Design an enzyme around this catalytic site. Structure first.
Site, mmCIF file in Angstrom:
data_model
loop_
_atom_site.group_PDB
_atom_site.id
_atom_site.type_symbol
_atom_site.label_atom_id
_atom_site.label_comp_id
_atom_site.label_asym_id
_atom_site.label_seq_id
_atom_site.Cartn_x
_atom_site.Cartn_y
_atom_site.Cartn_z
ATOM 1 C CG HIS A 63 -67.319 -24.899 68.170
ATOM 2 N ND1 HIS A 63 -66.835 -24.204 69.017
ATOM 3 C CD2 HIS A 63 -68.856 -24.729 67.829
ATOM 4 C CE1 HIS A 63 -68.191 -23.603 69.674
ATOM 5 N NE2 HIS A 63 -69.022 -23.886 68.890
ATOM 6 C CG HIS A 64 -63.253 -23.011 71.121
ATOM 7 N ND1 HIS A 64 -63.935 -24.314 71.569
ATOM 8 C CD2 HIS A 64 -62.147 -23.079 71.931
ATOM 9 C CE1 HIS A 64 -63.144 -24.729 72.574
ATOM 10 N NE2 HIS A 64 -61.896 -23.972 72.662
ATOM 11 C CD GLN A 126 -59.422 -26.205 74.407
ATOM 12 O OE1 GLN A 126 -60.249 -25.586 74.357
ATOM 13 N NE2 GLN A 126 -58.905 -26.825 75.527
ATOM 14 C CG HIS A 128 -64.411 -27.613 70.215
ATOM 15 N ND1 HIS A 128 -65.570 -26.640 70.413
ATOM 16 C CD2 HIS A 128 -64.655 -28.852 70.059
ATOM 17 C CE1 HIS A 128 -66.623 -27.670 70.408
ATOM 18 N NE2 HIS A 128 -66.284 -29.056 70.412
ATOM 19 C CG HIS A 198 -65.778 -21.390 79.858
ATOM 20 N ND1 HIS A 198 -65.863 -22.142 78.634
ATOM 21 C CD2 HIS A 198 -65.606 -22.392 80.847
ATOM 22 C CE1 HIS A 198 -65.969 -23.501 78.892
ATOM 23 N NE2 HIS A 198 -65.964 -23.592 80.246
ATOM 24 C CG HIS A 200 -69.813 -26.656 80.890
ATOM 25 N ND1 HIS A 200 -69.101 -27.573 81.705
ATOM 26 C CD2 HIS A 200 -68.381 -26.050 80.839
ATOM 27 C CE1 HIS A 200 -67.855 -27.670 81.875
ATOM 28 N NE2 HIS A 200 -67.414 -26.500 81.201
ATOM 29 C CG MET A 270 -65.925 -24.926 84.504
ATOM 30 S SD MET A 270 -64.704 -24.878 83.272
ATOM 31 C CE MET A 270 -63.701 -26.064 84.073
HETATM 32 CU CU LIG Z 1 -65.630 -24.554 70.610
HETATM 33 CU CU LIG Z 2 -65.427 -25.499 80.994
#
Ligand SMILES: [Cu+2]
Ligand SMILES: [Cu+2]
Ligand code: NI
Length: 310
Positions: A63-64, A126, A128, A198, A200, A270
């Site tokens: 996804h990312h 990271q 996802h 960014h 949520h 966030m």
């Molecule tokens: Cu993602």
């Molecule tokens: Cu966040």
């Protein structure tokens, strides 16, 4: 992209340059939306400059992806769930790859400074994994990023100006809650070239501006529900001593039976605006942060676009 195997993660590109592949260690997500993290100690101890990134992502599951530079990864393991943490120290984002919003290359002559005495000693990746359908084959995954590093000093240095809310509270059902952030810029001039937003699920629109003598110059404006990649700016915007950076995230409490505050889980929120910039090498600092709101009133003059979705 294929696990490297016998060749290793370091590819000499020339005497002064080399590519470093940062890949998942053959992982298999067992639940949808798994956030896996891994680290890579920089191969050289001396200062280097990161001048390019090439994603090696599986178009299906990933996804990312986010790549960070830091000195103390959260775990000493092979890989780990990012919910455990990315970096103990401050995670300096260097690259974001979003599935349906292809990344833009760094301008040439611009590079992030790493290694040496003050730069990042590690890269933490990271990944996802959203839909883990194609993982029933129980196949191992090695998605990641290939970084191009050089020891040749770069004339322009990339850095990050992160504006983030720390005190926001979104009452349940509240139609509109704003999270304003503002700080006076007190360093040598920086030139913004890309930005990433960014938030949520409650985020509607996130906007950032340079405010000079009362006039607002848009840096970036994006709906945080669209892929959170670093988007290029419409036109380069210098931010100078005396200017004030202002940002606003517009939230809603609708759908929530309780208040939502700033936090790391999906049930929290966030308000982050990553402003990627470059500075002349001799004047350059790698990161700045604004977690305050020094000019609350100034927001009475924020462009209307900052409140209307996109
Ligand atoms: Cu993602
Ligand atoms: Cu966040
Ligand atoms: Ni300029």
């Amino acid at each position: 992209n294929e696990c490297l195997g016998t060749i290793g993660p370091v590819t000499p590109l020339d005497a002064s340059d080399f590519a470093l592949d940062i890949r998942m260690p053959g992982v298999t997500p067992k639940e949808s939306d798994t956030y896996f993290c891994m680290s890579m100690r920089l191969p050289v101890d001396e200062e280097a400059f990161v001048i390019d990134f090439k994603p090696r992502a599986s178009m299906d599951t990933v996804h990312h992806m986010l790549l960070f530079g830091c000195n103390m990864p959260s775990s000493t393991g092979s890989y780990w769930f990012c919910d455990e943490g990315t970096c103990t120290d401050k995670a300096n984002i260097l690259y974001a790859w979003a599935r349906n919003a292809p990344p833009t290359r760094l301008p040439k002559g611009v590079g992030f400074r790493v290694g040496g005495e003050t730069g990042s000693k590690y890269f933490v990746l990271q990944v996802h994994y959203g839909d883990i359908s194609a993982f029933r084959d129980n196949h191992k995954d090695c998605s990641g990023v290939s970084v191009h590093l050089t020891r040749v000093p770069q004339p322009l240095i990339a850095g990050m100006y992160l504006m983030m809310s720390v005190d926001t509270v979104i009452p349940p059902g509240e139609k509109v809650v704003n999270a304003d952030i503002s700080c006076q810029y007190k360093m040598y001039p920086m030139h913004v070239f890309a930005y990433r937003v960014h938030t949520h699920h409650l985020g509607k629109v996130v906007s950032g501006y340079r405010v000079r003598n009362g006039q607002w110059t848009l840096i970036g404006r994006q709906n945080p529900q669209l892929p959170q990649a670093f988007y290029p700016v419409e036109h380069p915007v210098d931010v100078t001593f005396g200017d004030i950076l202002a940002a606003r995230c517009v939230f809603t409490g609708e759908g929530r039976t309780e208040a939502t505050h700033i936090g790391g889980t999906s049930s929290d929120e966030m308000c982050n605006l990553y402003i990627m910039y470059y500075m002349e090498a001799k004047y350059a600092l790698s990161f700045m942060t604004c977690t305050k709101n020094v000019a609350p009133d100034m927001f009475r003059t924020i462009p209307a676009e900052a409140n209307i979705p996109i």
